[PDB]
Amino acid sequence: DIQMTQSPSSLSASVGDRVTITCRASQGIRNDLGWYQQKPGKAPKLLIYAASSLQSGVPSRFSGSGSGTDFTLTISSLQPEDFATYYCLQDYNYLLTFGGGTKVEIKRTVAAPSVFIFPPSDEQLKSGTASVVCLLNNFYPREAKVQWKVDNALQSGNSQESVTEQDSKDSTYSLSSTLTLSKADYEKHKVYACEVTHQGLSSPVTKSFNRGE
Amino acid sequence: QLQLQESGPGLVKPSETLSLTCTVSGGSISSSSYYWGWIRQPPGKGLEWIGSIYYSGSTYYNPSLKSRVTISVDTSKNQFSLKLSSVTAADTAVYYCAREITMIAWFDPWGQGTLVTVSSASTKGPSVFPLAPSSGTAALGCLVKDYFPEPVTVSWNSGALTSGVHTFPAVLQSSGLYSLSSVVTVPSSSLGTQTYICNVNHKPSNTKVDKKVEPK
C-alpha cells in the first residue's frame, strides 16, 4: 500500500511563528492529499483537500502545497487555538492511508502553577478509602513535581497524576495528583501536605490541611 | 447543515461482533456526490480508514480488514452501519463516521466518535465524591472513582459553566478500574450563593449522577 511519511512527529513553536509540516508519499499520488486537524477529544477537522484547496470557514493562515510525492501543510502565523495533532490523508487508487500525525505544541512564557489541596469527602470515608487530591492549575512549561507528606513523611507508590493537554486559549497545563489511602491509615495522622516544585516558583510551594478543622 | 450521529455499545466481548450505526440528519444519504465512511483511532495512536459505501451499495474496504468488515447502507432510514467480526483487544478504538468525497481526500463532516472497548470484563458504574472548596478565587471539583469501561462525561451546571473547567484524563488503577477528577475555579464570593453541580454521565452503565459541591 501507499505509505505517507509525516514529519516531524512533534514540534514546538511560538505564537506568530510559521509552522511547516511535511508529508511524503511512497509513490506518486498526484494531488489526492488532504490535511486534517484534531483537537483534544474531538473528531479530525478538514483543513485542506486536494493538497492545496482551503475548506470553507478555515482561516487563511492555513495553506497546503505539493503534487506527486511531496506535500506541505503550512500555518503562516501560529495561534494558541492551533494546538492540535495534524494528519495528512491520501486516497489515491481508492485505498486510503493516513500519516503518523504531527503534534503541534505552543511555546509561551513561564507560568507558575496555582496549588490547591482537597481533603477526602465524608461519604468516601464511609466506604473505607480516603482520597486526597492536589490541583496544579494553569502552568507552563509542563514539567512539575508533586510530593505527598503524611505527618511530614514522604509517600511513594500510593499516588497517581494526570495532566490536561495544552489549553487552547492560554496554552497552559493543569495537573491533578490523587493520593489514595485506606480509611484506617488516613485517621492515624493529622498533617497532609502537597509540595510542588516548578520552574515558575522561586521556591517549592506547599499546601496542606489537618484532618478535621 | 449535515450532521452525523453514531450509536452502538461501547463495550464488546472478545470474538464477538462490533456493531455501529451512523444516522444522517440535515440531508439525504442518497446523494450521488458523496460516499460514507468509517475511520477508527486506537487510544494514543493514529487514524485508520476502515471502508466507505455508496448509497447504491457499492463498497470500498481497507484491505487489511476486508475479511472482518461489513459496511451496509439503509437509504430508507438515512443510516449506514459498520460490522467488525471476531474483535480482539487490538480493535479497541474510537470509531468515527464521516461523509466522503472521493479522490480529493475529503472527510466532512464527522461523527463525534464512539469509543469501543473490547474486553470480557463487566461494566461498573462510578462513585462521585465532592472536592470541597476550602479557603479571590476558589477551586472545587468532583472525584469520579472506580468505573469500567471508559468513558465518563463531566459537565458543570448542565453545561452552563465551562470557563475555568479542567476535566483530567482518566487514570487506570491497580484493580483495573478507572478514575478521574474534574475541577473548576470560581470566585470565592460566589460560594455561598451560586450553586456548583457536576453532572457525571457513564453511558456503559446508564448511570447519571448530580453531585452538588458545598464548602465543608
Residue numbers in the entry:
A (entry chain L): 1 to 213
B (entry chain H): 1 to 135, 141 to 221
Show passages lifted from the paper.
To enable the model of the Fab and its interactions with the virus to be accurately modelled, we determined the crystal structure of the 38-1-10A Fab. There were nine 38-1-10A Fabs in the crystal asymmetric unit and the structure was refined to 2.7 Å resolution with good R-factors and stereochemistry. The nine copies in the asymmetric unit were essentially identical (rmsd 0.7 Å). The VhVl domains of the crystal structure fit well with the EM map with minor adjustments of some surface loops and side chains. Antibody 38-1-2A has identical heavy and light chain variable germline gene segment and CDR3 regions with 38-1-10A, indicating both antibodies were derived from clonally related B cells. We analyzed the sequences of neutralizing antibodies 38-1-10A, 38-1-2A and 38-3-11A using the IMGT tool to determine its closest Vh and Vl germline genes. The antibody Vl genes were also identical to germlines (IGKV1-6*01 for 38-1-10A and 38-1-2A; IGKV1-39*01 for 38-3-11A).
In contrast to the canyon and fivefold vertex epitopes, the margin of the pentamer is not within or adjacent to known receptor binding sites, but we have shown that natural infection can induce neutralizing antibody responses to this part of the viral capsid (notably the so-called the plateau epitope, located close to the icosahedral threefold axes). The cryo-electron microscopy (cryo-EM) structures of the EV71 virion in complex with two representative plateau-binding neutralizing antibodies reveal that their binding footprints are conserved in the great majority of circulating EV71 strains and these antibodies are therapeutic for lethal challenge in a murine infection. In summary we have shown that humans naturally infected with EV71 make an antibody response that includes rare neutralizing and highly protective antibodies that bind close to the threefold axes of the virus capsid, and larger numbers of non-neutralizing antibodies, many of which do not bind the viral capsid.
